[PDB]
């Protein structure tokens, strides 16, 4: 079969671009590969909690594992699961794991909800190239309102329990002269206020995250996607996996495309093809698919920038022991509302989130989420005989984002006489998690291998939307600058293409 325009992928900047699409009334067909998150499940929730993870929590494992800086406390809650189409994918490369969402509204189903602009000058050093006064006069704004994106009540926040542990880090801080921020957020915090109250079903105030939020959080299926699909021109068919892009002989695209149930079993292959064709697929999988195209000679005139630029948005996790007067509560909310915004463009640069921990005891734990400004980049290298391309990233490329977030909370430590926990991330000796990333940028980088709105290199009316664009590194949590990107390039692709 035949669409006018294909979407791959249902993320956010897929998301944008068919809203958009739609309201041009251009006829569009979304393909994902995961699932349509709406089916109460055995405990009558659509996603499992952080402390009861079933297959649900994970995309095709064998075992639950815990969150990132928890497995002290969770591990006791793993269990042995049958692989199925769960909701977060941590995908292993040699020497970095990036984790993703998988489902209709793709990482908005399993991030943080933190809505954050990154710094005009930053944007400005990265980006040279793109108008930076559209980006933020129209295109920003634009995101923020279609997002939902709201901001706690300060007094609530003050008073809370469930925030006692943003509080202690802010406090100690400040002993070290550095200041912290509110971040926005697509989670609904007059919700979340009515949790803490007992007036509705906890979500976030119930170990709720990195699995889905039950409620309470604005995820692009609610927002977004909902309104592509009134637009009464966008359709979404999940557990559709694009596998191959080639170009018809009169310049359109075709699919193959592969249709499995939530047990990873093949039901069939269906060519599907296009005039326009949409890549959001994230930085990983829009990727792979052009990779993966020129190299096995489907896509030949891509080219050699397809797979280079990728970095992990400075990611590094570490935490620090308080004192034990400083207790950072067990009851905390799993949506983070504080930063420590040390960013100043230079090298030394950091942008953490006060991270909450769902153990649900006292720990005296702090937790950190650490964006910093390292300019290593890795590449994805297609391997033909696996049919896979692999990251070529190395662990030693993340030791200018240690040095940089290390500087930072050795300040603090200093100021405050406490010292790191050494034990949250393995048995060996480690306070810096250094292998990780939940914000993959780059691999189809903006105006390296597409112009300047994502029209790839070589191609005409092929496009990629998503992280994919991002060179590497964007100093705050990425998805508004993916959401207002993607906003700012399919107006301009319809206006001028379609
Ligand atoms: C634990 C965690 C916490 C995070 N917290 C935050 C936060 O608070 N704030 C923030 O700004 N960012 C956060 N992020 C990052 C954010 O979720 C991510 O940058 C965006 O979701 C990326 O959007 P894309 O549109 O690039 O991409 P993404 O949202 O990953 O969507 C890609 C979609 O394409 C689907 N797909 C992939 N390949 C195929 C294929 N071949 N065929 C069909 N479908 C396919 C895939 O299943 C998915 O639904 C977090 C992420 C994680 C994992």
Known sequence: ???????????????????????????????????????????????????????????????????????????????????????????????????????????????????????????????????????????????????????????????????????VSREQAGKAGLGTVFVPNVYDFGYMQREAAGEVPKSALATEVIYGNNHGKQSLDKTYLA???????????????????????????????????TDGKLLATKEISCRYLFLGAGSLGSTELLVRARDTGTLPNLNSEVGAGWGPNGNIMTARANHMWNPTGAHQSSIPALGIDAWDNSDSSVFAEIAPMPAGLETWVSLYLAITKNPQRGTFVYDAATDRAKLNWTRDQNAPAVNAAKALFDRINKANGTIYRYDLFGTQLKAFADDFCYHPLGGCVLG???????????????????????????????????????????????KQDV
């Open 1 to 167: 079969g035949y669409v006018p325009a294909v979407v791959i992928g249902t993320g956010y900047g897929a998301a944008v671009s068919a809203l958009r699409l739609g309201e041009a009334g251009v006829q569009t067909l979304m393909l994902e590969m995961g699932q349509l998150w709406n089916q109460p499940g055995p405990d009558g929730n659509i996603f499992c909690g952080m402390l009861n993870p079933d297959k649900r929590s994970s995309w095709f494992k064998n075992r639950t594992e815990a969150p990132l800086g928890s497995f002290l406390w969770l591990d006791v809650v793993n269990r042995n699961i049958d692989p199925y189409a769960g909701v977060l994918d941590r995908v292993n490369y040699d020497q970095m794991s990036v984790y993703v969402g998988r489902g209709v509204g793709g990482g908005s189903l399993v991030n943080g909800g933190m809505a954050v602009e990154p710094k005009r000058s930053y944007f400005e050093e990265i980006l040279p190239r793109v108008d930076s006064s559209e980006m933020y006069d129209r295109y920003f704004p634009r995101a923020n309102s279609m997002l939902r994106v709201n901001h706690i009540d300060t007094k609530w926040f003050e008073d809370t329990e469930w925030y006692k542990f943003a509080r």
């Open 448 to 494: 390296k291998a597409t112009d300047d709105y994502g029209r790839v290199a070589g191609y005409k009316n092929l496009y990629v939307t998503d992280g994919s664009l991002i060179p590497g590194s964007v100093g705050v949590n990425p998805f508004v600058t993916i959401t207002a990107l993607a906003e700012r390039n399919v107006e301009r692709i319809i």
């Open 227 to 261: 309104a592509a699909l009134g637009t009464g021109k966008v359709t979404i068919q999940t557990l559709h996996q694009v596998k191959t892009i080639r170009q018809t002989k009169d310049g359109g695209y075709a699919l193959t495309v592969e249709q499995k149930d």
